Amino acid sequence: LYFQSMKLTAIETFTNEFVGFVRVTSEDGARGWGQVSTYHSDITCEVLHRQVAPWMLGQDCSDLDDLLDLVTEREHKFPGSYLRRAMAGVDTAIWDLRGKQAGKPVAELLGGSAGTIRAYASSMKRDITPHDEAERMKRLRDAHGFDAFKVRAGAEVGRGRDEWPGRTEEIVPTMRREMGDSAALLIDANSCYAPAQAIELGKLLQDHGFSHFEEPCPYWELEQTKEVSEALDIDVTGGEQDCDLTTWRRMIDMRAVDVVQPDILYLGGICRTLRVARMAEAAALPVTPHCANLSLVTLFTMHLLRAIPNAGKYLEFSIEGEDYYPWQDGLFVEDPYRIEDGHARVTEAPGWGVEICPEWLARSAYKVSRA
Amino acid sequence: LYFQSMKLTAIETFTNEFVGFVRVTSEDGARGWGQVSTYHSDITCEVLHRQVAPWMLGQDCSDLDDLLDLVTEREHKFPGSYLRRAMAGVDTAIWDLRGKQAGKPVAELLGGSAGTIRAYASSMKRDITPHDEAERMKRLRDAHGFDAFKVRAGAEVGRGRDEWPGRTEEIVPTMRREMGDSAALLIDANSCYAPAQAIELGKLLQDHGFSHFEEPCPYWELEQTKEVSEALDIDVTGGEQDCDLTTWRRMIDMRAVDVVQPDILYLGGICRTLRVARMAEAAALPVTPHCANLSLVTLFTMHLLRAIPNAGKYLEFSIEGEDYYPWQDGLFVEDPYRIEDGHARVTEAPGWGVEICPEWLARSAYKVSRA
Numbered sequence: 001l002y003f004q005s006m007k008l009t010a011i012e013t014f015t016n017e018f019v020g021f022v023r024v025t026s027e028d029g030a031r032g033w034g035q036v037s038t039y040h041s042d043i044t045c046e047v048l049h050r051q052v053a054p055w056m057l058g059q060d061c062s063d064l065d066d067l068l069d070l071v072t073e074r075e076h077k078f079p080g081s082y083l084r085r086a087m088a089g090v091d092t093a094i095w096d097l098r099g100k101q102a103g104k105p106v107a108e109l110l111g112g113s114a115g116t117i118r119a120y121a122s123s124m125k126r127d128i129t130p131h132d133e134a135e136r137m138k139r140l141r142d143a144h145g146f147d148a149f150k151v152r153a154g155a156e157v158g159r160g161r162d163e164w165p166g167r168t169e170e171i172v173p174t175m176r177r178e179m180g181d182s183a184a185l186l187i188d189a190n191s192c193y194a195p196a197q198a199i200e201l202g203k204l205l206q207d208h209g210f211s212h213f214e215e216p217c218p219y220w221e222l223e224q225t226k227e228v229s230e231a232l233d234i235d236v237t238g239g240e241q242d243c244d245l246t247t248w249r250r251m252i253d254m255r256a257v258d259v260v261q262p263d264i265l266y267l268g269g270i271c272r273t274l275r276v277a278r279m280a281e282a283a284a285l286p287v288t289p290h291c292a293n294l295s296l297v298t299l300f301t302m303h304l305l306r307a308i309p310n311a312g313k314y315l316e317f318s319i320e321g322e323d324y325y326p327w328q329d330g331l332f333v334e335d336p337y338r339i340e341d342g343h344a345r346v347t348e349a350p351g352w353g354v355e356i357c358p359e360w361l362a363r364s365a366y367k368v369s370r371a
Numbered sequence: 372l373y374f375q376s377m378k379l380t381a382i383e384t385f386t387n388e389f390v391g392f393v394r395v396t397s398e399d400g401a402r403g404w405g406q407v408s409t410y411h412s413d414i415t416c417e418v419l420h421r422q423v424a425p426w427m428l429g430q431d432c433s434d435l436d437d438l439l440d441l442v443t444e445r446e447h448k449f450p451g452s453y454l455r456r457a458m459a460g461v462d463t464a465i466w467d468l469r470g471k472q473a474g475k476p477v478a479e480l481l482g483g484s485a486g487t488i489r490a491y492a493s494s495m496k497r498d499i500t501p502h503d504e505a506e507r508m509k510r511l512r513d514a515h516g517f518d519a520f521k522v523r524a525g526a527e528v529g530r531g532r533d534e535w536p537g538r539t540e541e542i543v544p545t546m547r548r549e550m551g552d553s554a555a556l557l558i559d560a561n562s563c564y565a566p567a568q569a570i571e572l573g574k575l576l577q578d579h580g581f582s583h584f585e586e587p588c589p590y591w592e593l594e595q596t597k598e599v600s601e602a603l604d605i606d607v608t609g610g611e612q613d614c615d616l617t618t619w620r621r622m623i624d625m626r627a628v629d630v631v632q633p634d635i636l637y638l639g640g641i642c643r644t645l646r647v648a649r650m651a652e653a654a655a656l657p658v659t660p661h662c663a664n665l666s667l668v669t670l671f672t673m674h675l676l677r678a679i680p681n682a683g684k685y686l687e688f689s690i691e692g693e694d695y696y697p698w699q700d701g702l703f704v705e706d707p708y709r710i711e712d713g714h715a716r717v718t719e720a721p722g723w724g725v726e727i728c729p730e731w732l733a734r735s736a737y738k739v740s741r742a
């Protein structure tokens with residue numbers, strides 16, 4: 001996968017506090033759109049102009065991986081999330097630009113094709129009863145054709161406490177009883193448990209035919225997660241908060257998890273996610289990326305899953321409504337997230353195949369850096 | 372060390388792009404002053420108001436360590452530097468408040484006492500010739516009585532290359548020749564070398580009686596640094612960019628370095644630095660913190676070194692002039708950094724014993740969050 005030299009002459013951000021989009025312009029005038037990670041995106045865009053753009057402007061992106069490494073090296077006093085959430089916006093915009101120059105969706109540029117991806121209906125909520133959770137999943141199944149469903153266990157980073165006593169013990173048998181025997185059932189504990197409790201819960205998930213046990217232990221304690229993986233046959237999965245490529249190497253080399261789950265934007269973009277996917281590929285681990293919302297993170301993940309040889313079983317697809325993500329409304333000219341028989345679809349449109357809504361841009365905070 | 376319960380009712384920041392100070396107010400009316408980490412402090416202060424203040428305001432901070440842990444847990448999607456740089460400003464402000472309430476310097480509250488600390492003259496520069504480096508260190512020695520001196524090796528995160536060919540091979544013998552046989556000589560490679568290159572340099576340092584070899588290898592590659600420590604008799608030191616307590620535990624448990632070097636403000640404040648010092652103490656490793664300018668980070672480190680039982684040999688004391696740090700002129704009413712016979716001194720003044728210059732504050736950007 002090789003690309004002619006290109007120099008960026010401008011990087012622009014259009015943002016609010018929830019989401020920010022990035023437009024890059026090359027010296028020949030070609031332009032591409034991407035997105036920084038959601039959540040405090042306004043801070044991320046400030047970091048982008050302060051600490052990413054100065055190193056990327058007027059440089060050759062023909063080896064984008066090396067350029068991104070150089071950013072991390074020049075900003076080595078800033079290990080962590082914000083720098084990477086910012087890099088992700090420039091990286092994703094460059095992919096859009098390349099796709100538009102080639103007349104190919106990003107998925108094709110990465111060696112795949114346009115086509116469908118199986119989706120799982122992902123609930124973000126713990127303030128929902130097991131009863132109501134099953135009832136809405138039943139409705140979503142009937143309306144859109146999903147055949148895979150993720151719910152929540154424990155309390156978010158809950159130090160071993162449940163959301164309320166008994167919730168987790170109820171939700172597991174409830175989902176299997178209510179969804180029937182063929183539904184794929186996933187759960188995510190969001191760093192709640194010590195290994196002893198996580199293994200207990202693991203046996204229960206196994207008893208009820210769950211096939212995906214996400215983030216059972218504090219994600220920063222790789223030895224805890226490995227102890228759980230080792231004691232259980234159900235797939236133990238993780239990685240969504242991992243933005244450090246050294247930590248990724250350590251997690252994969254020790255096989256802490258059975259399925260790796262990078263977030264394309266938390267990790268710092270497509271290039272860096274492909275590094276992780278190739279580490280996992282060499283380790284014979286599948287890749288099932290995290291996507292928390294219907295900003296572009298989901299679409300980026302769709303393209304990735306249509307390309308990588310070790311794609312996991314399905315796309316994470318948030319089923320929360322407006323009420324949950326009121327900011328995610330009216331981001332795009334055309335909706336890229338129609339679901340048909342439980343599948344999402346990447347089209348043959350060049351680049352990401354999305355346009356940012358001009359009305360949303362009008363209301364945005366604009367900032368530009370020039371070479 | 373037990374404290375009476377206290378609730379913060381306001382957190383205020385006063386910042387520019389280079390440094391920002393924090394004033395905290397308790398419900399009884401007492402106030403304390405601290406500082407976020409230098410460099411992009413305006414972004415750090417936004418993170419403070421966005422992501423630290425909401426979790427600390429109106430809460431009991433007597434168990435300050437637990438409240439800080441809670442911040443990192445509520446903000447678990449933001450591992451890394453900015454969150455910790457922000458938390459550090461609140462933590463150091465609370466310590467100043469506690470000192471002022473008790474009428475005691477922070478050093479005393481930590482179990483130590485007012486008194487002197489040996490300082491080393493720390494050069495930040497690689498553009499300087501070894502000749503010119505030796506000559507200014509001699510001037511500084513005669514003027515201030517320093518008997519320890521740190522210079523730079525390699526290029527900063529230089530991927531194994533030198534600043535220019537031969538600079539490092541020249542500077543090592545040049546410092547020992549020119550400074551004479553009794554001076555303590557330290558060097559810092561700022562993540563430049565692969566282990567075999569660092570071991571080769573380590574032999575040259577040993578031949579010339581250097582006593583401290585800092586950050587020989589990329590700081591994020593702990594196994595590389597351990598290889599170097601294991602091959603050399605000279606103390607290998609590091610940790611200034613490490614803000615993750617789990618990484619600290621890993622680094623200390625594997626004995627990757629001989630001396631640990633947290634930066635109090637990068638790490639997230641006094642409480643979290645004491646946690647690192649205690650881990651190091653249990654492993655019989657000394658603590659020689661990083662402090663690379665004459666914002667309050669140097670003073671905070673002076674108080675810490677007056678208290679911890681496993682204090683290292685000396686305070687890092689930047690000897691760069693105003694060419695170098697123009698923003699550091701005119702920050703404080705007092706000058707807490709006079710050096711005499713190569714020692715700095717912590718007085719009995721309550722808290723940190725420093726007032727921010729009223730003119731500086733008048734020119735600063737102000738922001739407030741209230742309970």
Ligand SMILES: [Mg+2]
Binds near residue numbers: 188190214215240290
């Ligand atoms: Mg998850």
Ligand SMILES: [Mg+2]
Binds near residue numbers: 228229232236
């Ligand atoms: Mg297993």
Ligand SMILES: [Mg+2]
Binds near residue numbers: 561661
């Ligand atoms: Mg250093």
Ligand SMILES: [Mg+2]
Binds near residue numbers: 599600601603604606
């Ligand atoms: Mg050794």
